PDB file of C-alpha atoms in Angstrom:
ATOM      1  CA  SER T   1       5.825   5.451 -16.793  1.00 47.16           C
ATOM      2  CA  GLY T   2       3.051   8.038 -16.577  1.00 48.80           C
ATOM      3  CA  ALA T   3       2.441   7.102 -12.943  1.00 47.88           C
ATOM      4  CA  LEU T   4       2.205   9.922 -10.390  1.00 46.74           C
ATOM      5  CA  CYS T   5       4.745  10.083  -7.595  1.00 46.57           C
ATOM      6  CA  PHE T   6       3.102   9.797  -4.195  1.00 46.62           C
ATOM      7  CA  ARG T   7       4.418  10.361  -0.704  1.00 46.34           C
ATOM      8  CA  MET T   8       2.117   8.815   1.874  1.00 48.04           C
ATOM      9  CA  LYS T   9       1.863   8.811   5.655  1.00 50.42           C
ATOM     10  CA  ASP T  10      -0.545   7.190   8.099  1.00 54.11           C
ATOM     11  CA  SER T  11      -2.941   9.441  10.019  1.00 52.97           C
ATOM     12  CA  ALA T  12      -0.371   9.529  12.837  1.00 53.20           C
ATOM     13  CA  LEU T  13       1.940  11.066  10.201  1.00 55.95           C
ATOM     14  CA  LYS T  14       4.450   8.201  10.147  1.00 54.76           C
ATOM     15  CA  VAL T  15       6.151   8.224   6.732  1.00 54.11           C
ATOM     16  CA  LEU T  16       6.055   5.169   4.455  1.00 51.53           C
ATOM     17  CA  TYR T  17       9.587   4.381   3.274  1.00 50.44           C
ATOM     18  CA  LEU T  18      11.851   1.527   2.179  1.00 51.36           C
ATOM     19  CA  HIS T  19      14.543   0.049   4.412  1.00 50.38           C
ATOM     20  CA  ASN T  20      16.338  -3.131   3.353  1.00 48.23           C
ATOM     21  CA  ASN T  21      13.626  -3.411   0.674  1.00 46.73           C
ATOM     22  CA  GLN T  22      10.813  -3.455   3.240  1.00 44.81           C
ATOM     23  CA  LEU T  23       8.022  -0.890   3.534  1.00 45.44           C
ATOM     24  CA  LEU T  24       8.262   0.729   6.966  1.00 44.60           C
ATOM     25  CA  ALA T  25       6.171   3.412   8.666  1.00 48.66           C
ATOM     26  CA  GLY T  26       8.027   6.119  10.583  1.00 51.52           C
ATOM     27  CA  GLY T  27      11.126   8.173   9.830  1.00 50.95           C
ATOM     28  CA  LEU T  28      10.278  10.912  12.342  1.00 51.87           C
ATOM     29  CA  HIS T  29      13.262  10.132  14.569  1.00 54.00           C
ATOM     30  CA  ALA T  30      16.122  10.484  12.184  1.00 53.97           C
ATOM     31  CA  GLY T  31      18.742  13.170  11.780  1.00 50.51           C
ATOM     32  CA  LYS T  32      18.368  12.738   8.042  1.00 50.88           C
ATOM     33  CA  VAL T  33      15.101  14.150   6.736  1.00 49.11           C
ATOM     34  CA  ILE T  34      13.374  11.263   4.977  1.00 48.09           C
ATOM     35  CA  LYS T  35      10.673  12.274   2.505  1.00 50.42           C
ATOM     36  CA  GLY T  36       9.357   8.776   1.887  1.00 48.98           C
ATOM     37  CA  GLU T  37       9.218   6.223  -0.907  1.00 49.23           C
ATOM     38  CA  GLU T  38       7.665   7.193  -4.230  1.00 49.79           C
ATOM     39  CA  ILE T  39       4.377   5.298  -4.233  1.00 50.35           C
ATOM     40  CA  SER T  40       2.544   4.417  -7.418  1.00 49.55           C
ATOM     41  CA  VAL T  41      -1.221   4.413  -6.975  1.00 46.65           C
ATOM     42  CA  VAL T  42      -2.515   2.997 -10.258  1.00 43.81           C
ATOM     43  CA  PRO T  43      -6.151   1.997 -10.997  1.00 44.17           C
ATOM     44  CA  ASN T  44      -6.838  -1.631 -11.969  1.00 44.77           C
ATOM     45  CA  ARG T  45      -8.776  -1.930 -15.244  1.00 44.50           C
ATOM     46  CA  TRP T  46      -9.159  -5.686 -14.795  1.00 45.82           C
ATOM     47  CA  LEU T  47     -11.655  -5.185 -11.959  1.00 51.63           C
ATOM     48  CA  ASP T  48     -14.906  -3.233 -11.656  1.00 55.01           C
ATOM     49  CA  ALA T  49     -14.255   0.489 -11.214  1.00 55.19           C
ATOM     50  CA  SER T  50     -17.036   0.556  -8.619  1.00 54.87           C
ATOM     51  CA  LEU T  51     -14.924   0.334  -5.465  1.00 52.60           C
ATOM     52  CA  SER T  52     -11.867   2.114  -6.896  1.00 54.25           C
ATOM     53  CA  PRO T  53      -9.444  -0.803  -7.374  1.00 54.63           C
ATOM     54  CA  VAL T  54      -5.754   0.128  -7.327  1.00 53.33           C
ATOM     55  CA  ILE T  55      -2.326  -1.474  -7.345  1.00 52.21           C
ATOM     56  CA  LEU T  56       0.388  -0.080  -5.081  1.00 53.08           C
ATOM     57  CA  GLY T  57       3.978   0.039  -6.279  1.00 51.81           C
ATOM     58  CA  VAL T  58       7.337   1.261  -5.024  1.00 51.67           C
ATOM     59  CA  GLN T  59      10.456   2.511  -6.842  1.00 51.45           C
ATOM     60  CA  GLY T  60       8.668   3.734  -9.969  1.00 51.92           C
ATOM     61  CA  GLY T  61       6.406   0.690  -9.979  1.00 49.69           C
ATOM     62  CA  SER T  62       9.321  -1.743 -10.348  1.00 48.98           C
ATOM     63  CA  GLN T  63       7.956  -3.591  -7.306  1.00 49.60           C
ATOM     64  CA  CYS T  64       4.356  -4.074  -6.168  1.00 46.46           C
ATOM     65  CA  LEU T  65       2.571  -4.924  -2.914  1.00 47.24           C
ATOM     66  CA  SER T  66       0.831  -8.311  -2.839  1.00 47.90           C
ATOM     67  CA  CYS T  67      -1.346 -10.128  -0.296  1.00 47.62           C
ATOM     68  CA  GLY T  68      -0.066 -13.533  -1.385  1.00 44.70           C
ATOM     69  CA  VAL T  69      -1.766 -16.746  -2.487  1.00 45.91           C
ATOM     70  CA  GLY T  70      -2.154 -18.449   0.903  1.00 48.17           C
ATOM     71  CA  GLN T  71      -5.212 -19.187   3.031  1.00 46.41           C
ATOM     72  CA  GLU T  72      -4.621 -16.019   5.025  1.00 44.49           C
ATOM     73  CA  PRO T  73      -3.111 -12.885   3.462  1.00 41.44           C
ATOM     74  CA  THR T  74       0.487 -11.748   3.912  1.00 43.68           C
ATOM     75  CA  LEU T  75       1.961  -8.430   2.823  1.00 42.14           C
ATOM     76  CA  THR T  76       5.051  -8.739   0.652  1.00 42.58           C
ATOM     77  CA  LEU T  77       6.830  -6.726  -2.021  1.00 41.88           C
ATOM     78  CA  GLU T  78       7.000  -8.603  -5.320  1.00 46.93           C
ATOM     79  CA  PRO T  79       9.505  -8.085  -8.170  1.00 47.94           C
ATOM     80  CA  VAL T  80       6.562  -7.594 -10.541  1.00 47.37           C
ATOM     81  CA  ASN T  81       6.369  -4.385 -12.555  1.00 46.41           C
ATOM     82  CA  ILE T  82       3.193  -2.302 -12.526  1.00 43.27           C
ATOM     83  CA  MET T  83       3.346  -2.519 -16.333  1.00 44.92           C
ATOM     84  CA  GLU T  84       3.045  -6.304 -16.640  1.00 45.10           C
ATOM     85  CA  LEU T  85       0.033  -6.128 -14.307  1.00 42.32           C
ATOM     86  CA  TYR T  86      -1.487  -3.281 -16.337  1.00 42.48           C
ATOM     87  CA  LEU T  87      -0.777  -4.963 -19.666  1.00 44.60           C
ATOM     88  CA  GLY T  88      -2.334  -8.226 -18.492  1.00 44.03           C
ATOM     89  CA  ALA T  89       0.924 -10.189 -18.544  1.00 43.33           C
ATOM     90  CA  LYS T  90       0.414 -11.275 -14.927  1.00 42.70           C
ATOM     91  CA  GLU T  91      -2.574 -11.911 -12.644  1.00 44.41           C
ATOM     92  CA  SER T  92      -3.269  -8.747 -10.667  1.00 45.21           C
ATOM     93  CA  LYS T  93      -5.952  -9.678  -8.137  1.00 50.36           C
ATOM     94  CA  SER T  94      -3.618 -10.298  -5.185  1.00 53.27           C
ATOM     95  CA  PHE T  95      -1.944  -6.999  -6.068  1.00 52.17           C
ATOM     96  CA  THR T  96      -5.254  -5.157  -5.922  1.00 54.96           C
ATOM     97  CA  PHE T  97      -6.746  -3.005  -3.173  1.00 54.71           C
ATOM     98  CA  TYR T  98     -10.124  -1.310  -2.989  1.00 55.33           C
ATOM     99  CA  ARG T  99      -9.508   2.356  -2.287  1.00 51.12           C
ATOM    100  CA  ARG T 100     -11.826   4.271  -0.006  1.00 52.12           C
ATOM    101  CA  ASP T 101     -11.578   8.038   0.293  1.00 49.58           C
ATOM    102  CA  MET T 102     -12.624   9.349   3.696  1.00 50.25           C
ATOM    103  CA  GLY T 103     -12.178  13.117   3.563  1.00 51.42           C
ATOM    104  CA  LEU T 104      -8.457  13.797   3.891  1.00 54.04           C
ATOM    105  CA  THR T 105      -7.329  10.171   3.969  1.00 55.11           C
ATOM    106  CA  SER T 106      -7.723   6.894   2.083  1.00 56.13           C
ATOM    107  CA  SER T 107      -7.911   3.256   3.176  1.00 54.10           C
ATOM    108  CA  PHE T 108      -6.934   0.150   1.217  1.00 55.47           C
ATOM    109  CA  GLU T 109      -8.787  -3.172   1.409  1.00 54.32           C
ATOM    110  CA  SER T 110      -7.315  -6.304  -0.189  1.00 57.13           C
ATOM    111  CA  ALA T 111      -9.470  -7.428  -3.120  1.00 61.50           C
ATOM    112  CA  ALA T 112      -8.221 -11.008  -2.764  1.00 62.14           C
ATOM    113  CA  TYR T 113      -8.963 -11.116   0.967  1.00 66.37           C
ATOM    114  CA  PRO T 114     -11.997  -8.985   1.912  1.00 65.77           C
ATOM    115  CA  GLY T 115     -11.929  -7.407   5.374  1.00 59.27           C
ATOM    116  CA  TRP T 116      -8.139  -7.160   5.382  1.00 58.66           C
ATOM    117  CA  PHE T 117      -6.831  -3.599   5.297  1.00 57.01           C
ATOM    118  CA  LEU T 118      -3.404  -2.117   4.626  1.00 58.01           C
ATOM    119  CA  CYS T 119      -2.273  -0.845   8.023  1.00 58.56           C
ATOM    120  CA  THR T 120       0.511   0.418  10.268  1.00 58.60           C
ATOM    121  CA  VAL T 121       1.308  -0.386  13.899  1.00 57.34           C
ATOM    122  CA  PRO T 122       1.798   2.277  16.614  1.00 55.25           C
ATOM    123  CA  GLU T 123       5.446   1.250  17.162  1.00 55.80           C
ATOM    124  CA  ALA T 124       7.958   3.380  15.237  1.00 57.05           C
ATOM    125  CA  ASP T 125       9.587   2.201  11.999  1.00 56.69           C
ATOM    126  CA  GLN T 126       7.958  -1.236  11.850  1.00 58.34           C
ATOM    127  CA  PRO T 127       6.795  -3.008   8.670  1.00 58.20           C
ATOM    128  CA  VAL T 128       3.517  -1.995   7.068  1.00 59.72           C
ATOM    129  CA  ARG T 129       1.090  -4.923   7.313  1.00 61.20           C
ATOM    130  CA  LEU T 130      -2.554  -6.015   7.094  1.00 63.43           C
ATOM    131  CA  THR T 131      -5.338  -6.248   9.668  1.00 61.66           C
ATOM    132  CA  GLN T 132      -9.036  -7.019   9.994  1.00 59.76           C
ATOM    133  CA  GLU T 133      -9.033  -5.168  13.274  1.00 57.68           C
ATOM    134  CA  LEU T 134     -10.128  -1.609  12.491  1.00 53.76           C
ATOM    135  CA  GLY T 135     -10.181   1.268  14.944  1.00 55.20           C
ATOM    136  CA  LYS T 136      -7.887   0.538  17.892  1.00 55.84           C
ATOM    137  CA  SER T 137      -4.071   0.624  17.548  1.00 55.61           C
ATOM    138  CA  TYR T 138      -3.799  -0.231  13.842  1.00 53.04           C
ATOM    139  CA  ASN T 139      -3.802   2.772  11.517  1.00 54.64           C
ATOM    140  CA  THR T 140      -5.663   2.161   8.275  1.00 53.61           C
ATOM    141  CA  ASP T 141      -6.078   5.725   6.987  1.00 53.05           C
ATOM    142  CA  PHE T 142      -3.378   7.302   4.806  1.00 51.98           C
ATOM    143  CA  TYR T 143      -2.507  10.836   3.627  1.00 52.96           C
ATOM    144  CA  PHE T 144      -1.498  11.299  -0.019  1.00 57.69           C
ATOM    145  CA  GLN T 145       0.759  13.855  -1.690  1.00 59.54           C
ATOM    146  CA  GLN T 146       2.210  14.304  -5.190  1.00 58.88           C
ATOM    147  CA  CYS T 147       5.976  14.838  -5.109  1.00 59.30           C
TER     148      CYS T 147
END
């Protein structure tokens, strides 16, 4: 694949992981140590490299995060490989996020829906989602680590 394996957490250190094929943020209250889902953070050639466009995938890029096609965005995991996006076999814009590095952490803004950021809620082990409401309770900064 060539993609680098990433473990990521929010700034409150809740781990991003898969449960019933959903991306949850938590895993701090288990007996089992959970390391987190392997995240693919792959740059998008099909957009301008100015605001660091990336596509986020899980399970070795066999599934990718999308913001949908609707009037408002909605975070879902799609059975679309990171390869078919990269090779141009499928439209990638709803799969694209602008990455913003802020010191130790990074934030992800939907390219299809500006102002909407990949976020987590304060409540433990709830689905990762999107928000326009920055600061406050929604966590929009993420730590990144190679596995």
